[PDB]
Amino acid sequence: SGIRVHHIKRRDIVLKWELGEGAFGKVFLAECHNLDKMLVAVKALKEASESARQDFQREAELLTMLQHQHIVRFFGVCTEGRPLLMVFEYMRHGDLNRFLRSHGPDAKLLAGGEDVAPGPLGLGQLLAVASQVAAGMVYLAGLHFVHRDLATRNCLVGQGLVVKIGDFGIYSTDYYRVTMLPIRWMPPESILYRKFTTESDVWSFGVVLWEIFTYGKQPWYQLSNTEAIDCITQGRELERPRACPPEVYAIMRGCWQREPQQRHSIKDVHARLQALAQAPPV
Numbered sequence: 196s197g198i199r200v201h202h203i204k205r206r207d208i209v210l211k212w213e214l215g216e217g218a219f220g221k222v223f224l225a226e227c228h229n230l231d232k233m234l235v236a237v238k239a240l241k242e243a244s245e246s247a248r249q250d251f252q253r254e255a256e257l258l259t260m261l262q263h264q265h266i267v268r269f270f271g272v273c274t275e276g277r278p279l280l281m282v283f284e285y286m287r288h289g290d291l292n293r294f295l296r297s298h299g300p301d302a303k304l305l306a307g308g309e310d311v312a313p314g315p316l317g318l319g320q321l322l323a324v325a326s327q328v329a330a331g332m333v334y335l336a337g338l339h340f341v342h343r344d345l346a347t348r349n350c351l352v353g354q355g356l357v358v359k360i361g362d363f364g365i366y367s368t369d370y371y372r373v374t375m376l377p378i379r380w381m382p383p384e385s386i387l388y389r390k391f392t393t394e395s396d397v398w399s400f401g402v403v404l405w406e407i408f409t410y411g412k413q414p415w416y417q418l419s420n421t422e423a424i425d426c427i428t429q430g431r432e433l434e435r436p437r438a439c440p441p442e443v444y445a446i447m448r449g450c451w452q453r454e455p456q457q458r459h460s461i462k463d464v465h466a467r468l469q470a471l472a473q474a475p476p477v
């Protein structure tokens with residue numbers, strides 16, 4: 196008894212090549228038949244655990260029931276032989292962090308694609324990406340879902356700057372080696388009391404908002420993991436980005452209140468973000 200997970204025939208999936216590697220294993224570009232031929236992203240678990248076979252069904256069940264407009268489209272699994280496979284839609288731009296970086300001032304005009312100009316994005320484009328991520332967080336907050344790793348590296352960019360949350364729950368400085376913590380995105384109540392609620396995600400979204408307007412710079416990049424923990428817990432906030440209007444900064448400062456109850460809800464942050472997106476101050 197639980198969520199009916201769509202199973203896919205292994206012979207209906209032809210692996211093209213590796214797109215990347217993660218904790219879970221490897222991601223590939225592939226063709227999928229009978230879902231007409233169609234390009235898709237496929238995750239392959241490294242397995243070698245009976246437990247990891249349990250986390251697979253868990254994630255597959257949550258993904259199958261969390262389907263929405265700003266969450267990466269999940270098509271089903273393949274348990275017909277090791278390795279286990281998760282099939283998703285293909286977001287041709289890859290993760291939001293690398294996308295931002297490729298449109299930043301250090302990148303000059305090396306960004307490609309036919310859908311977006313190389314070099315910096317429009318203010319209205321930056322607020323579109325921000326608003327799309329917020330909307331995905333509003334949906335997850337609705338189902339009492341808490342994202343413990345909200346960061347631009349866990350979002351995907353598709354054709355026409357469609358941004359979705361691509362990843363949910365070990366060598367980058369993003370994560371502190373303890374359990375790996377992405378402390379730099381964590382509010383004080385998570386570092387100090389080990390609490391993570393909906394309001395925690397509102398604080399994390401503020402950092403995502405900062406990441407977006409810095410073109411994917413790492414929060415407190417000048418500081419170590421412990422130095423960042425000191426700042427966060429002492430009330431020191433990130434500097435406004437060069438490319439950030441005060442109305443956006445103000446939204447950021449609204450997520451960075453020490454008292455979680457003194458933070459605006461994610462539905463209000465979305466709303467303020469959607470508004471500006473339809474009317475970018477510039």
Ligand SMILES: CS(=O)(=O)Nc1ccccc1CNc1ccc2[nH]nc(-c3ccc(N4CCNCC4)nc3)c2c1
Nearest residue numbers: 214215216217222236283284285286289290349361362
């Ligand atoms: C763990 S990973 O290989 O870095 N994949 C990944 C990256 C960012 C956010 C989420 C993931 C999780 N895997 C995943 C899930 C659904 C996906 N749909 N499309 C992709 C996808 C992933 C990567 C990708 N590229 C962009 C071109 N550079 C090579 C990698 N193009 C599309 C994808 C990945």
